[PDB]
Design a protein around this ligand. Structure first.
Ligand SMILES: Nc1ncnc2c1ncn2[C@@H]1O[C@H](COS(=O)(=O)NC(=O)[C@@H](N)CO)[C@@H](O)[C@H]1O
Ligand SMILES: Nc1ncnc2c1ncn2[C@@H]1O[C@H](COS(=O)(=O)NC(=O)[C@@H](N)CO)[C@@H](O)[C@H]1O
Ligand SMILES: [Mg+2]
Ligand SMILES: [Mg+2]
Lengths: 368, 359
């Protein structure tokens, strides 16, 4: 949520910034500001974020690598996965329903190897601490990171357990951002212990409400996908620099795997609810002849910290202030598997195993 | 479910075998447990289970033994209070080197079963539909043991899902409705998944630590085999789970469960129990079961001889190799040192970047 003092003493400045991201603040209602409307207001954009309406106004910052030229017919990841009996979408319908998958054999092992390579890289070289977290969370946690009240329909919710004294309303996590960031809920942190850098590998569950029609086949858009998440808790004055550092950590994954990509900064109209600034990384997908989002890295400013009342304290004076939080994908594992399968395919239908993954796959050089 | 021909032609024989496991046989067919195998000892509860063998000797300590919760807290590696804040009781947050050892355990097990024991690795959904739960027997009788999700408003009729209590459920259902060539058997599958259990009627049982949780990781083994091979396959599969404990240098004992302590769907179960120093006893770390044709009948999973065209029901088997949270308990307590550090078992060091000690 936003600083209530800014809504008091500068309703004009605030309503204008929010207008740049397409949100009209009822000034009349703004004075009143009752109920939970304060919890439905998105974060203020940083000054340097380009103004725009939708994704067509996003701005490319840089890119790395050149898409490979194919002298044979380019096959998509579903065709490749099914001809090696490694992806089975029909079995997933039988077990559960649509937008789930079963992976088998060498392709399942490559999916596992990707998550292990990412986790090792961030913990051994980038200074992140590894965490194993619950995949179910409670209402206070979802309010803390902003998923509630506005995005309840994006989540899977559990029913109450048939028991005496059980009244648990849990939701499945849509991203490890939720549990990791809430680890500092209600804490007051010594400024000398900052930054806190955490990573986790979790499944992620999303209803994908109102996304039907788009990406109907394949691994791009699923109800369940694996993701290695990075989160940082930092001093307010360090957060813009930490965003550059964290985005670089995600780029390093793509570079070591040899995947061409581009980095874009989102405009005001395309940013997510809680971010004040976001870089997306988009990886080359040969069969779609374009770049597709593979990571989103955001500075959240003090927006989550205020809901969570997570504060830091200086060593000189005992005064406290809100920390800043950041999160970013490093990376979404399912979409990385898509990019590896299509970019490393060979003319005979085999898939070359990227060099850095071979130690995680018992030396295997080719799939198939 | 049981063979309906058998209930017709031999109600006496059937009602007697079911009596052994404490079930009085007067959609209702789906509430009847499996028939115990002849070699299973008759008994009422876990006091009548029978020890079969042991391997290794518990280590003798010349200092006071610390439990895994104390050890987890001194290394800032297990944090139960943070889990209550995020979610509720019976959850845990693991951090740092303890989290990495938990991950390394699952990778070592998966690599062993796929590289040496001939199992095929699978990534599966952690939500399943009701037909799948009926197939492996969790429905209709054990709905209360599960977390259920509310239907998605845009898939309102087809999204009554539940979180899996074990990868047995999705893996075994991969052959639902199939006819398999006998030459393609046995089918050997493994998976590493989280497991979710309501733990109803268990308030008080192991209230401290990692032994009993709402969420835990497990590496599961499943086999689909010809009906005449299933008792041999149980011995093979139980030995796959034993090899994990042996390579980790963990003392254990193997018991066979009596009729009265067996699970709903098993006809024969070996449990493996691992030595837990701070409890001065063995605790269950794996359960390996022959399920006979009980699940195959609900699923109509069949096999065909190449000679003729007749089909018959396959047999199915499942076993833990292993439950990862409880293995972490065993490794932490059996390898602790006097200063509180924890020796990393030799076989895990390649999965922990060469680390020799925690702490
Ligand atoms: N339904 C989905 N199926 C597969 N992958 C997805 C799905 N939704 C998102 N992703 C992947 O996960 C990444 C992170 O998702 S995000 O919502 O944009 N951002 C977050 O969740 C933040 N916590 C940063 O990780 C996306 O960039 C995309 O690569
Ligand atoms: N609530 C729990 N918390 C932690 N570990 C558990 C819990 N319940 C069971 N386990 C572990 O998981 C193992 C397998 O559980 S089981 O119900 O007995 N059997 C199965 O699920 C079969 N699919 C074989 O794996 C147990 O032997 C025990 O080691
Ligand atoms: Mg995004
Ligand atoms: Mg049991």
């Amino acid at each position: 949520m936003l600083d209530p003092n800014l809504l008091r003493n500068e309703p004009d400045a605030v309503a204008e910034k929010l207008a740049r991201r397409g949100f009209k603040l009822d000034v009349d209602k703004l004075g009143a500001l009752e109920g939970d409307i304060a919890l439905t207001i998105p974060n203020l954009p940083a000054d340097e974020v380009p103004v725009g309406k939708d994704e067509n106004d996003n701005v490319e910052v840089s890119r790395w690598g050149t898409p490979r030229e194919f002298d044979f017919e380019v096959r998509d990841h579903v065709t490749l996965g099914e001809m090696h009996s490694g992806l089975d979408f029909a079995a997933a319908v039988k077990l559960t329903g649509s937008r789930f998958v079963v992976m088998k054999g060498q392709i399942a092992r490559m999916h596992r190897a990707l998550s292990q390579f990412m986790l090792d890289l961030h913990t051994e070289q980038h200074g992140y601490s590894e965490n194993y977290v619950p995949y179910l969370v409670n209402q206070d946690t979802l309010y803390g990171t902003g998923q509630l009240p506005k995005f309840a329909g994006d989540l899977f919710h559990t029913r109450p357990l048939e028991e005496e004294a059980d009244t648990s309303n849990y939701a499945l996590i849509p991203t490890a951002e939720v549990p990791l960031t809430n680890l500092v809920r209600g804490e007051i942190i010594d400024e000398d212990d900052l930054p806190i850098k955490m990573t986790a590998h979790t499944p992620c569950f999303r209803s994908e409400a109102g996304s039907y029609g788009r990406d109907t086949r394949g691994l791009i858009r699923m109800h369940q996908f694996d993701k290695v998440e990075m989160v940082q808790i930092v001093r307010p004055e360090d957060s813009m620099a930490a965003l550059e550092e964290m985005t670089g950590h995600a780029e390093k994954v793509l570079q070591l795997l040899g995947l061409p990509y581009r980095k874009i900064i989102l405009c005001t109209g395309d940013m997510g609810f809680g971010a004040c600034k976001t870089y997306d990384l988009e990886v080359w997908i040969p069969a779609q002849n374009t770049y597709r989002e593979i990571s989103s890295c955001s500075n959240v400013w003090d927006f989550q910290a205020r809901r969570m009342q997570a504060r830091c304290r200086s060593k000189s004076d005992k005064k406290t202030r809100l920390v800043h939080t950041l999160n970013g994908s490093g990376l979404a594992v399912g979409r990385t598997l898509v990019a590896v399968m299509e970019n490393y395919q060979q003319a005979d239908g085999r898939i070359e195993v990227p060099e850095v993954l071979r130690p995680y796959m018992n030396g295997l050089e080719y799939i198939g």
